[PDB]
């Protein structure tokens, strides 16, 4: 009926980690290869995703429990959840008004048509925009957001995890914290935790769609050369 | 005592290939990751070198004789001569006035101190600036320049070449053309061909110094992630 001391520590630790790794200004984007509007936007998005992966890794490094997993396990979670955590954190920039990620002026405003000049299909971008709208509407607290991210990342059903029991133990402790939080701290959310866990199942389809289309990119050597070594390590299959 | 029809074709083919692959404006540099002044300039230089490698490959594709070599041989020449051809073509941008490559305003003016923020040593940058000055002073015709480049690239003494006899046969035909050219077309160059062949021996030392320092870069995973996949293919040892 009231948040415990250990549940409160987990929330402080996660909120801080997000703040330490999410620049709400998007000021570092001027360091990426400029966007252009033969896969025109692919340089800029690969730099964008590469930068994000580094922030996701820094966040994960601070989820309580994550550091003590084997390095193999840590890599296995990152490699599979990477794109999912990105789509998740990217919701803070998605604007319902124009239905686009707004990270700057005309330059860093990514609308549905630009990601088409990046090797992905207008047709399979449908669920991604849909996902971002339904999540925007969930009006999540920063605590629920950061919590959902850590839960997504700590899924024991990723290819490569060995200690799927410890990772499961970590992920349930984080769900308890979340149910508690919504329950004692989020009025009107009698149905919100289920709505949130539903979003997790959506992300796996997105993750799946992206893997099929990124494989198409990484198998054409003229497109993969536009990727970054981090991107190719993370989304490649060298495990 | 007069250039032959076949020697003239080789010159036309090489001059055109250079023009088709060297933008004297440096206008595409705005597409590279911006220069910054922890290896500050390394993103921009890796993009610069990566772009150059693509122009070198396009030039090589048009050196008569090159296309008919096996793909293994073509790769072997490129992987070893790459940095040398770059230092060679880059002389067109080196300015004796301020002793720096001038490719734009304050942004794309690379002076000796900037390449220091790119993982290389002030101490071993000495021969490179020295090489560029002595070559600038040679006041080479565009024909002698393009010819010197093709000769550098067609050296049969590269690690990996299998048909070191055909590549040697190609490289001598190109030297004949060059000696002829200087002889019947470059007044006052009674000593120039030897001066030019000397520059080739210098490039191997530069090539050597760079390989030792790039290996240091590619062995630190925080610096290699700033490289490009093309750069890592070309200067890596995956043969």
């Amino acid at each position: 009926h009231m948040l415990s001391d250990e549940q409160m520590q987990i929330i402080n630790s996660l909120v801080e980690a997000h703040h330490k790794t999410y620049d709400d200004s998007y000021s570092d984007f001027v360091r990426f290869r400029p966007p252009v509007r033969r896969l025109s936007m692919l340089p800029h998005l690969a730099d964008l995703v590469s930068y994000s992966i580094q922030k996701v890794i820094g966040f994960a490094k601070m989820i309580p429990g994550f550091r003590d997993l084997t390095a193999e396990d840590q890599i296995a979670l990152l490699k599979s959840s990477a794109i999912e955590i990105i789509m998740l954190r990217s919701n803070q920039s998605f604007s319902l008004e124009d239905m686009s990620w707004s990270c700057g002026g005309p330059d860093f405003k990514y609308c549905i048509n630009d990601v088409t000049k990046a090797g992905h299909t207008l047709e399979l971008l449908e669920p991604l925009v849909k996902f971002q709208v339904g999540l925007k509407k969930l009006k999540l607290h920063e605590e629920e957001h950061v919590l959902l991210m850590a839960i997504c990342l700590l899924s024991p059903d990723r290819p490569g995890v060995q200690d799927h029991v410890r990772i499961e133990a970590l992920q349930d402790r984080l769900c308890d914290v979340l149910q508690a939080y919504i329950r004692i701290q989020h009025p009107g959310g009698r149905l919100l935790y289920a709505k949130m866990i539903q979003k997790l199942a959506d992300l796996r389809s997105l993750n799946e769609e992206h893997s099929k289309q990124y494989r198409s990119l990484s198998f054409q050597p003229e497109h993969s050369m536009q990727l970054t070594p981090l991107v190719l390590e993370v989304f490649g299959s060298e495990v | 005592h007069m250039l032959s029809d076949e020697q003239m074709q080789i010159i036309n083919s090489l001059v055109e290939a250079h023009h088709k692959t060297y933008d004297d404006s440096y206008s595409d540099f705005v597409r590279f990751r911006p220069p910054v002044r922890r290896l500050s300039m390394l993103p921009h230089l890796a993009d610069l070198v990566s772009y150059s490698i693509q122009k070198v490959i396009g030039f090589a594709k048009m050196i008569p004789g090159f296309r008919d070599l096996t793909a293994e041989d073509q790769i072997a020449l490129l992987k070893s001569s790459a940095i040398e051809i770059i230092m060679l073509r880059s002389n067109q941008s080196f300015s004796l006035e301020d002793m720096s490559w001038s490719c734009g305003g304050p942004d794309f003016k690379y002076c000796i101190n900037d390449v220091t923020k790119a993982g290389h040593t002030l101490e071993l940058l000495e021969p490179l600036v020295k090489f560029q000055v002595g070559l600038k002073k040679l006041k080479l015709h565009e024909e002698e320049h393009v010819l010197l480049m093709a000769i550098c690239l067609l050296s049969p003494d590269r690690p990996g070449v299998q048909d070191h006899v055909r590549i040697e046969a190609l490289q001598d035909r190109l030297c004949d053309v060059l000696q002829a050219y200087i002889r019947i077309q470059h007044p006052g160059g009674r000593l120039l061909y030897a001066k030019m062949i000397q520059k080739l021996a210098d490039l191997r030392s530069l090539n050597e110094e760079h390989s030792k320092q790039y290996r240091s870069l590619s062995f630190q995973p925080e610096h290699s992630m700033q490289l490009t996949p093309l750069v890592l293919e070309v200067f890596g040892s995956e043969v």
């Binding site: 580094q54 890794i57 490094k61 390095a71 840590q74 890599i75 990152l78 490699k79 070594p229 981090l230 390590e233 993370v234 060298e238 495990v239 | 995973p221 925080e222 290699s224 992630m225």
Partner: peptide
């Protein structure tokens, strides 16, 4: 290989 991922996890 994962050279970079290992580095990035301090």
């Amino acid at each position: 290989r994962h050279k970079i991922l290992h580095r990035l996890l301090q």
